[PDB]
Ligand binder design. Sequence first.
Ligand SMILES: *C(=O)c1ccc(O)cc1
Length: 307
Amino acid sequence: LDTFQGYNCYSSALGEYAKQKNIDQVENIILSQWSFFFDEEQFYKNQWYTGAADGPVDVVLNEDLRNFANIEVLEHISSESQAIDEGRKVLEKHGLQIVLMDFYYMNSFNWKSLSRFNVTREHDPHFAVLTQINENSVHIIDPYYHHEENMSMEDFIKSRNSMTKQGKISFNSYEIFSNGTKKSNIKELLYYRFNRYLQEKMFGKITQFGQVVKKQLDNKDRKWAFTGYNCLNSVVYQHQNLINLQKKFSLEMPPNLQELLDNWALIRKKLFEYYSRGSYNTEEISNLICKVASSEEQFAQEVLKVL
Ligand SMILES: *C(=O)c1ccc(O)cc1
């Protein structure tokens, strides 16, 4: 499909809703995001431990949407008995419902395409955009993976009432709401993000990620490398969104933005290879991560200087 990518599952869902219904401000606020996190506790619990944002809900993006656009993303919780009639009302009023779903039931990505035939099924929260309720099925978009599908009513209800690795889903839905949308200018969105990235030392979390990778040389369980590969797609997507913003709005950027994107892509390639090819190159991967930390810090300072 030609869906809004955003930079993560949550932002893809909000942006796809905003794109379809030409809701102002949402897309530009998502596409200007500049963030990195690292959670060492999540690393050792096999949760999505790095990349743009903790999840599944990007609470930082919710704050940016409130503060810049006066846009609230309201969490709704429902029950098995009420959830579908709630959906019918939402589809009549708004045409789309953003729902939290256990990815275990979504087909979305084909790992056999990348020669990974033994991908373990995992109970992991994800987002879908519900477009249609039938008597025994629903139609959903996964905008993050540019995928749409018909799901059985049984599988849809199961997926929305699942205990996952990152919490209990109870028919959670997300409403984009405003009392009165506020306008922002593209340089204002970027200055705020790049200053916050430096003030909160987000480049430091890249270095922390690097330091933990160095310490996995004897870890027989390489799942962390696969999890890391998936988590860092959000960073590649932010780099691509900033290049796109630069072209669209004729912005002055530091000259090494595509180089940095290429650096993150190589880290992702090396983690995927480490996961599956049995190599002993934790030090090589750690070194690349610790280098990109330094380049990203200098990049953020250069954005503030030249923008
Ligand atoms: C997004 O929420 C998401 C969740 C899980 C996988 O595997 C991929 C994407």
